[PDB]
Putative 6-phospho-beta-galactobiosidase
Amino acid sequence: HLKPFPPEFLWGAASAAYQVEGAWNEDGKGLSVWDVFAKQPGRTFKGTNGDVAVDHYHRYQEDVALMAEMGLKAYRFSVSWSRVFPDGNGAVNEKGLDFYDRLIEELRNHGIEPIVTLYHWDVPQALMDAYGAWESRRIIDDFDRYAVTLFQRFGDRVKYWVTLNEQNIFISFGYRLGLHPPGVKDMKRMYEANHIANLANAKVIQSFRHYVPDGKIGPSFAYSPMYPYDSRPENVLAFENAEEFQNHWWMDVYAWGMYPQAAWNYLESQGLEPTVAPGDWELLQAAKPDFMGVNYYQTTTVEHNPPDGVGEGVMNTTGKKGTSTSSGIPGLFKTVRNPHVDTTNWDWAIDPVGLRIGLRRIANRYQLPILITENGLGEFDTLEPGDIVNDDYRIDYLRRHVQEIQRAITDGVDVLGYCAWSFTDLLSWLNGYQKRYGFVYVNRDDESEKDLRRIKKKSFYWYQRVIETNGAEL
Amino acid sequence: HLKPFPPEFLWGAASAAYQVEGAWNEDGKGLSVWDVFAKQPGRTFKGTNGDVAVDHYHRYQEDVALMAEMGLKAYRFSVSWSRVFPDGNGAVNEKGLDFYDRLIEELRNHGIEPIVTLYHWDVPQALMDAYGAWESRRIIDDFDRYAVTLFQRFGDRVKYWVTLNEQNIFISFGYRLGLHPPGVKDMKRMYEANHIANLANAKVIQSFRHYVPDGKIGPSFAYSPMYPYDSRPENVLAFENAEEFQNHWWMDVYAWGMYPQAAWNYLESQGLEPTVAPGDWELLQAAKPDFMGVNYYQTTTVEHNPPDGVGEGVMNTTGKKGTSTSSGIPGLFKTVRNPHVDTTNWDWAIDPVGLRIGLRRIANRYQLPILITENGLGEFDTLEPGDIVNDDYRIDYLRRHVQEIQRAITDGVDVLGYCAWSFTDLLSWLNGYQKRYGFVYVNRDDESEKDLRRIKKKSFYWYQRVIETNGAEL
């Protein structure tokens, strides 16, 4: 017996500025670390970068019109820091602010709730040149000034804010795996930058309380809920280590302002724990958010990993199924393929019940409302004669995840909204354009840039029907 | 490289008054609910009862001398409420307090720390008669009067105190399964009595802060940590349901003063959630314990249970292995044999790693120190001529659990002490005498008290060596 979706449920769709906007050097925009990073040969598939992307900076009016046709209740986007402060910490760029002002007015005139994401991985290169960006406490007050600038200019028209998007991703990929700017493989640096990012998150939530007292703000965590492989006690203990190290490590800081103790002690024994100053715990414990943002795609199953066993592993960005290899941390846990779910061709788990599990774990541990900021299926799309993209695969994935959300709401989880990823096709950070996520097909591939024309996929009309029935018809 | 056991680690052993004392009608003692219940035909194996038990009431000097020979650092025992208040809430029976005073003085004269359990299932029958005992709010102030009586008489000599022993057992066996007094099978009444017992726990922790400001106090929860059968998402969701419904339901109230929400909502949908009065949440939230007491014997593995599925199961009462069957809650979860561990003859899982997992979960969720108030192996013992009892099976079980305690300490779990169940053999509530737990064999069976003579088992000398080496030699 299912509860209905609440009447105010934020049926949404999401983007990220570098992935969508283009206009990388217009109206005074400074360079970001991704402008620099993606132009380095070999970082991105076939050299694709965000110079143009899908050109949303010039075509947003067309884009919002398609949102209004769909009847989106909400649209989640990120503000590009380097459009607002080209130097990170210097003088404000009114043209940068003007674009987001025009975007929000376009959204508001069509009855769409704007959800503004403060940071999605594009710190200005200048801050990285001046003091190493997230490795320096100086970024805390420069990020605050940036945040406060947006709060004063948009706080009367934006109720929902997200601080740092997938902080575990841009910290891990940027400082442990070397896949994102700064392209570093140093765990000591990774956890120092992570700690400073935690303090930045807390400082801007505390500013938000002052500048937007009637608004709602939270971080957004890239949450892959951990599973034990079986009921072997050694595999359950691996799951305890994995859920605490991969998930509590961030969410406990967001919710309670404390790192988990066992994980901390493991890092301490390695010489990897971050440097703490007077003031840190009191700041982190005083920044309670209104919700936990959740970006969800898959669960992860783990098993026992001996002290000499698997370390970092092989990722699968080609799309040939079966090429992923176990990654893990020796002594604690290593991943293993879950034999009870299917995977995509990138070996990502297809596990909509895993979303209910993860929503239940956040409610049960933190008692926080949840805003689902990102969920989606990336796949190749064929444009067929008659402007028809029959992405039944995407509909089937979104249907099952929305169905499990309703069960979680029926369990008593407070889910504020759901932002599918993504509204239009967009540039992936590293693999180009062919793994598409959008409701709206964008006419370009890896080689030919074509005209970037927007085409409504079959999933666009499915989700239009979802919204008008408030999820009653899926 | 393991951490050592900390210098003042409480190497202990435990009992419970009804199981050990006898003297059921001496020196002014009133009837308890167990005096009455165990004399009803069919309630206990072979009609065994606590009239004599192993006669610790008269033989406490001999028993304490054996604790000194072992070198016990702490002895955990329970106070019989009906010795102190024969009618539960009238005038104090000084001879009742004088026994526990004599006992505490014997312990302290031999260097043994007393750990006093306020309530181990034996509320006076007069309170059951007057208002139904734990089902009535009247018990909150009656329990409080009793606790403060003990705090004022013994607080100068007792630092460690336990409030309610295994509230989840005496409430669920007493009101849901009807196996303990008052023998009721009614889930609604069960959760009402459970809520009243939560308030009584909170009230006496509050009183304790006034009367024993330098003491340490906590409840003793009967903790069986849940495992999912495998990585099937439906079995992991069963584990989420099972851990919250069986474990968080109690420990969250103990630690945070709040029931978990998914469980509460499920009870509400069934008309089973308890009645909440004004002021209840404030009392419950303001009664933080110094430690979580943990009674640990086994883990429990669970899997999906369809809404038409398993409910009450068969309980192994005889000692014939393989006779237990699944128990669960339809629609939420059901138990299933863990194929990766062995089980005793009573079908209890032998899972020392589970104790590390359980200690880690409590640290990770509540950040509380833990006092392990019960752990042991119940088995048949053979008395061999020469008064020799070779219980290597017990040594092996205790050894592997103490080993995992030290791994948990090395992880960063603050464990205050370890109380093996039990010091001497004693009466099991339902299963008679042959399922023995003691370091010290007591010569009696279900048919005859014989001479009740005390006989040191092999495990006595093993534990004596454990304590002498502070656990470095196991």
